[PDB]
Amino acid sequence: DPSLQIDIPDALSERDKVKFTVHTKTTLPTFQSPEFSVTRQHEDFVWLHDTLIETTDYAGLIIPPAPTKPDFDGPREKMQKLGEGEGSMTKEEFAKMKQELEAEYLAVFKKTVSSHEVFLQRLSSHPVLSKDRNFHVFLEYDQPDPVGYYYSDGSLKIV
Amino acid sequence: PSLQIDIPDALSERDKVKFTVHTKTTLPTFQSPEFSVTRQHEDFVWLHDTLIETTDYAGLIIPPAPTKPDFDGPREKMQKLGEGEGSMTKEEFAKMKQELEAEYLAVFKKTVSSHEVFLQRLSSHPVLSKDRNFHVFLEYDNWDPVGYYYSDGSLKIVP
Numbered sequence: 001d002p003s004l005q006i007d008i009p010d011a012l013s014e015r016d017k018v019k020f021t022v023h024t025k026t027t028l029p030t031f032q033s034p035e036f037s038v039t040r041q042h043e044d045f046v047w048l049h050d051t052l053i054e055t056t057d058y059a060g061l062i063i064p065p066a067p068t069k070p071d072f073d074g075p076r077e078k079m080q081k082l083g084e085g086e087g088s089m090t091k092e093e094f095a096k097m098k099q100e101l102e103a104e105y106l107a108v109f110k111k112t113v114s115s116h117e118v119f120l121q122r123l124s125s126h127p128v129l130s131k132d133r134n135f136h137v138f139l140e141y142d143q144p145d146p147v148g149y150y151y152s153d154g155s156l157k158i159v
Numbered sequence: 160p161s162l163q164i165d166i167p168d169a170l171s172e173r174d175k176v177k178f179t180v181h182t183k184t185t186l187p188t189f190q191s192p193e194f195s196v197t198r199q200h201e202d203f204v205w206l207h208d209t210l211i212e213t214t215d216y217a218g219l220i221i222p223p224a225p226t227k228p229d230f231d232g233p234r235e236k237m238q239k240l241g242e243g244e245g246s247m248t249k250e251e252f253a254k255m256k257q258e259l260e261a262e263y264l265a266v267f268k269k270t271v272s273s274h275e276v277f278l279q280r281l282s283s284h285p286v287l288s289k290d291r292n293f294h295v296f297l298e299y300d301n302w303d304p305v306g307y308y309y310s311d312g313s314l315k316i317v318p
């Protein structure tokens with residue numbers, strides 16, 4: 001489906017509130033531009049799903065489930081038991097334990113990014129919902145400094 | 160395959176680059192088989208100088224230091240563009256910010272490869288690969304980190 005291609009290439013979590021980058025590649029004329037990105041929070045996805053669910057014309061349609069709210073609590077307080085407890089172990093078994101707790105944080109971050117992304121892709125596939133204008137507002141409504149840049153795999157990304 | 164080094168990503172805050180130095184190893188010397196650290200250009204310079212002034216490596220081939228990352232050309236163009244935002248159309252501010260970002264990206268790609276080739280050359284060298292100062296550079300680990308930045312299946316700390 002060249003028509004509408006959506007991905008979440010990156011995300012930021014500060015204090016376990018997540019800001020997702022929603023990147024759209026489309027050939028459909030409804031959109032102002034062929035490629036664009038916006039930053040979204042979980043409430044935006046909930047609004048999108050609930051708006052589709054409450055549309056009368058989509059009664060009985062297959063509406064892909066909403067992504068679950070991001071939850072970092074399991075890793076977060078595990079991190080605060082260890083993190084502020086250096087003197088409890090060796091310098092190297094503090095380091096070891098700090099890495100796998102961050103590995104736990106990564107597992108949660110990856111799955112919630114995939115959870116929010118799969119939702120957007122399923123909408124893209126749907127012949128009715130993919131043309132929904134509330135979906136389109138979710139993809140492109142935009143606009144709130146070159147301080148910081150992240151380089152990976154030959155690509156530049158802003159903070 | 161024993162000792163494998165790459166720089167998967169890097170972060171530039173105020174044009175100071177923090178490189179992700181990623182190590183995949185099966186050798187018993189390292190506390191972990193695969194691990195990653197953040198290094199800055201001064202750390203690479205220190206390693207090169209330590210090797211040069213090491214007596215046991217006197218006649219060896221020492222790979223040149225990576226060039227210091229230089230973003231000045233794009234940076235000043237960027238600071239001017241930033242000051243004329245309110246002076247031009249939003250469509251021509253987008254165009255020029257895209258061109259300066261591509262210019263910034265070219266410098267970023269070239270200095271990341273400059274730093275990575277140095278590490279891989281050290282890696283490949285039969286003597287130098289096994290120097291513990293190099294091991295300190297690969298394995299050794301100022302504020303709290305704000306949150307976590309997710310991209311490419313990886314976590315990066317944001318300060």
Ligand SMILES: [Cl-]
Nearest residue numbers: 014017019041
């Ligand atoms: Cl905020």
